Design an enzyme around this catalytic site. Structure first.
Site, PDB file in Angstrom:
ATOM      1  N   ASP A  39      -3.758 -26.298 -10.586  1.00 46.67           N
ATOM      2  CA  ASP A  39      -2.783 -26.302  -9.568  1.00 46.67           C
ATOM      3  C   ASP A  39      -1.539 -26.461  -9.948  1.00 46.67           C
ATOM      4  O   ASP A  39      -1.292 -25.360 -10.767  1.00 46.67           O
ATOM      5  CB  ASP A  39      -3.454 -27.845  -9.008  1.00 46.67           C
ATOM      6  N   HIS A  69       1.732 -30.559  -4.901  1.00 50.34           N
ATOM      7  CA  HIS A  69       0.267 -30.594  -4.479  1.00 50.34           C
ATOM      8  C   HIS A  69      -0.460 -31.129  -5.559  1.00 50.34           C
ATOM      9  O   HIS A  69      -1.702 -31.831  -5.438  1.00 50.34           O
ATOM     10  CB  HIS A  69       0.262 -29.154  -3.954  1.00 50.34           C
ATOM     11  N   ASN A 161      -8.946 -23.630   4.418  1.00 46.48           N
ATOM     12  CA  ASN A 161      -8.418 -24.426   5.615  1.00 46.48           C
ATOM     13  C   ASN A 161      -8.397 -23.383   6.645  1.00 46.48           C
ATOM     14  O   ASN A 161      -7.073 -23.236   7.236  1.00 46.48           O
ATOM     15  CB  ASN A 161      -7.012 -25.162   5.362  1.00 46.48           C
ATOM     16  N   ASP A 200     -21.385 -26.814  -0.076  1.00 46.25           N
ATOM     17  CA  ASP A 200     -22.392 -27.793  -0.872  1.00 46.25           C
ATOM     18  C   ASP A 200     -22.183 -29.256  -0.136  1.00 46.25           C
ATOM     19  O   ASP A 200     -23.028 -30.149  -0.371  1.00 46.25           O
ATOM     20  CB  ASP A 200     -22.281 -27.873  -2.313  1.00 46.25           C
ATOM     21  N   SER A 224      -8.238 -29.216   0.291  1.00 42.73           N
ATOM     22  CA  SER A 224      -7.575 -29.550  -1.242  1.00 42.73           C
ATOM     23  C   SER A 224      -7.531 -31.085  -1.624  1.00 42.73           C
ATOM     24  O   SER A 224      -7.459 -31.348  -2.602  1.00 42.73           O
ATOM     25  CB  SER A 224      -5.964 -29.198  -1.208  1.00 42.73           C
TER      26      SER A 224
HETATM   27 CA   LIG Z   1     -22.811 -24.424  -4.504  1.00 45.00          CA
END
Ligand SMILES: [Ca+2]
Length: 279
Positions: A39, A69, A161, A200, A224
């Protein structure tokens, strides 16, 4: 263990129901695990990290988080107050500049770095990588995320997003990693969260209180912010011996709260990360 007046997202991942404010977790708290936060960096001197965070790599003139962030994401993984896995070791890899931007070649380099660097760290209970970043589809970026996963690191990635199908974003669209969407405190899909068959799992992503630079705190929103909840949860479960890096995404989906989210498009999983902790 019980932490009262916790941030809603910590309470939500240890609850079958929304609307509660206590976080329940095993005191082991991810001790002996490691989480890489790839990040903008991590303000390691923040009191909330208690000496458990350090910067290990940068691709810029400094390793400092000049943005915030990365510090926020790291806080949700493993800060004392705001974190899922309160005793994990946090390692920062600065692939994003202080504007929050990065070229894909740098991002790829950072993922291959973690695949190797874990061999230089003491993480007996396992290793996780948290990637709260993304952009348009790139096979090279997906391949790097697949390699990192293959190397024995649980990779958690933000869905994005754009309120769109995550199939068109990277590394969200890489099937072999754990792609995380965002929910809000009322169990709605966050209005910005990407969706699609590649997701997932969902985690808390709207109005998430965590650490910020200058020794501060703030609440912000995004996929995030959902991603580090799942990354932290994986580290916590690995410490408990319940799963491994290779299988943690599947274990989290298998043990998730099922069917409790609203505004989930047809074809997207209705699964919300849950720690299954019974005191
Ligand atoms: Ca996956």
């Amino acid at each position: 263990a019980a932490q009262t007046n916790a941030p809603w997202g910590l309470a939500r991942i240890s609850s079958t129901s929304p609307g509660t404010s206590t976080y329940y977790y095993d005191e082991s708290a991810g001790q002996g695990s490691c989480v890489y936060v790839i990040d903008t960096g991590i303000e390691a001197s923040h009191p909330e990290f208690e000496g458990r965070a350090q910067m290990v790599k940068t691709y810029y003139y400094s390793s400092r988080d000049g943005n915030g962030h990365g510090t926020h994401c790291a806080g949700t993984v493993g800060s004392r107050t705001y974190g899922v896995a309160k005793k994990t070791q946090l390692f920062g890899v600065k692939v994003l500049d202080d504007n929050g931007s990065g070229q894909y070649s740098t991002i790829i380099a950072g993922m291959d770095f973690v695949a190797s660097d874990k061999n230089n760290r003491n993480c007996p209970k396992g290793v996780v990588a948290s990637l709260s970043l993304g952009g348009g589809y790139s096979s090279s970026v997906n391949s790097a995320a697949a390699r990192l996963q293959s190397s024995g690191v649980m990779v958690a990635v933000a869905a994005g997003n754009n309120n769109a199908d995550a199939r068109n974003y990277s590394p969200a669209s890489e099937p072999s990693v754990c792609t995380v969407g965002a929910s809000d405190r009322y169990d709605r899909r966050s209005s910005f969260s990407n969706y699609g068959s590649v997701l997932d799992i969902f985690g808390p992503g709207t109005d998430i209180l965590s650490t910020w630079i200058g020794g501060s705190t703030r609440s912000i929103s995004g996929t995030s912010m959902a991603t580090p909840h799942v990354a932290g949860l994986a580290a916590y479960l690995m410490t408990l011996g319940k799963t491994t890096a290779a299988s943690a995404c599947r274990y989290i989906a298998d043990t998730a709260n099922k069917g409790d989210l609203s505004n989930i498009p047809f074809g997207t999983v209705n699964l919300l990360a849950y720690n299954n902790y019974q005191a």
